[model samples]
Target: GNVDLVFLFDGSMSLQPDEFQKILDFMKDVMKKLSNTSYQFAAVQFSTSYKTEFDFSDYVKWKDPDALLKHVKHMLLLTNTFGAINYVATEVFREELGARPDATKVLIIITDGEATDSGNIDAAKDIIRYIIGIGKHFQTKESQETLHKFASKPASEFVKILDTFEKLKDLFTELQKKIYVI
Candidate 1:
């Protein structure tokens, strides 16, 4: 599978420590199951700021989940989802940053479904986005539409809203299936 999984995770203060750990574990779980050298994984966390935890090249270097993600610390800052989105679209995915032009670009976005900042949606226009919208913020119609607007079309399939992080575990198999088949 020639795919590059770029994770755009929310690192806002709105998301608590316990809940944040769930996301990291879920990411580790998924990456372990999807373990293939040809399939790359990159993670960028965002809040008032954005930081790349690791990139495709890092995965190629070790291929160990614990070593790869154990150092990731939660930011717990202001919500600025779009800021990180644009960061990954531009700076994080460059060839020097480990993006493979020939590989399928799949960006997995896990956020609380709200943004205090903005950016051009066109930045991710060519990427296939699978968004997991969680928490109370997404309870409103505005947030739902916001996430739906940025996600790949047929929002019901590409986007999922959840009250808890446990949904990540439940959807793991389904997501795994979709990723490979694609």
Candidate 2:
């Protein structure tokens, strides 16, 4: 089955500029493996507000990974994790972005700290959600619990905790496997 994947990134103050660059690198790597044929890619960067960096329809127009990566930028502010998730669920995941009714829907969220806003756990159920927690700050009990809550059921299977942003590059292989299995 084909897949419509949307990546939601936390561009809050907690993420250092260097870490944000690493995220861009991580996303570039992942984008290289996808195409309009089997996988439609979209992304949202969120801090105090969310920006739809690119959507599946954008990918279709660009047809080049470099062009798509150019749209992803850093927004250092507050963490509006919940708002971003809900926005993606209702706004970005719709057919206008090239999301097909028959396609597998995937939502990947990467954040380093606690959400500045309350969470909407129900929003996660709309798609196959994977939550990536980066940095030691995110290792706290509260953060882990929140990450698990934001992820799909069997949190251990859908949640990835990385010690640093660089480690996110290593997640590509396992993530691809997991997404394909879905």
Candidate 3:
């Protein structure tokens, strides 16, 4: 897919260390499918705060699978899940990667449990409005791509992978395959 993606990872304490590792593995699987030429990847890890585990431009610089995998492995720390997701939707999407108009902006939020901060959802909506509004201001096309447990999972899932994190790997692999045909 010719899209730029920001992966919002759930970093709450509920995710055991092994489970967190599994999530990272799932991400790597997804990464393998994205076209480096057509797609850019970024990541945000959240628990109590948000951290840009991998910035958008990093995709251009670190093309090697091993380096990207190492970066993900190194960032396996706990974060406030709710605050992080809202932060990614509001701050990271708007402030960090908002300037890249050549690529489709997609935000993918993956969470195992509920939010840690209740106020984050409202704030996230505000940010989403800001992102869409900015796109409108520039008269640029706006669309969203998302994957979550909710029936409202953003855009569409080419395949169902919500059964487990391991399945998420297959989900993204299928997504990459299907998106290319479109």
Candidate 4:
């Protein structure tokens, strides 16, 4: 099965403005890696709230790396991750882009701090349930009602975060290789 990866960027103030550009650089690298893959990407940037900066199909069609970098450069600083996350899981996930069939819908929430919303983790839980209920077939369905703490990480280790994903690359790659079987 092809994966529908949603990069939920943490546009919070804690991520430093300089790191914002770094994110674009990271995205450029990811795009190149994805050039030959059967994956689609959607970007949802979140601060105090979530904004679907770019949709998967839109990005797939809009291949101008410079333009994408320009868009990231112009983003205003906002730091309300908790609210943004819930918003993305609800409004954006429901309205703009609902769940997809035959694809793994992974929400890569790259945050640098904790939740700062009214519902906090509870709200996040609700959104997770919303994701599974709408999408179905998430890997964590049997373990819990919502996928709250699956890949969550504190912002305390922002600098070393990408390294975390890099470490898991082999595991994901192996899983991808076996995706056709299950």
In model 4, residue pairs whose N, Cα or C atoms come closer than 3 Å (at least 3 residues apart or on different chains), thus clashing, are 47-80, 48-80, 112-155
Candidate 4: regions farther than 4 A off: 64-66, 73-78, 94-99, 118-182
Off by over 4 Å in 2: 176-182
Residue 172 in candidate 2, Cα distance off native in Å: 2.4
Query: Highest TM-score: which candidate?
Result: 1
Per-candidate clashes come to 0, 0, 5, 3
Q: Which stretches of candidate 3 lie above 4 Å from their native place?
A: 72-82, 94-99, 120-161
lDDT per model, in order?
A: 0.82, 0.82, 0.53, 0.50
Output the better candidate (1/4) by TM-score.
1
- Using all chains and alpha carbons, the TM-scores for the candidates as numbered come to 0.91, 0.90, 0.66, 0.59
Off by over 4 Å in 1: 176-182
lDDT of 2: 0.82
* Best first by TM-score, ranked: 1, 2, 3, 4
Q: Which ten residues in a row have the lowest lDDT in candidate 3?
A: 128-137
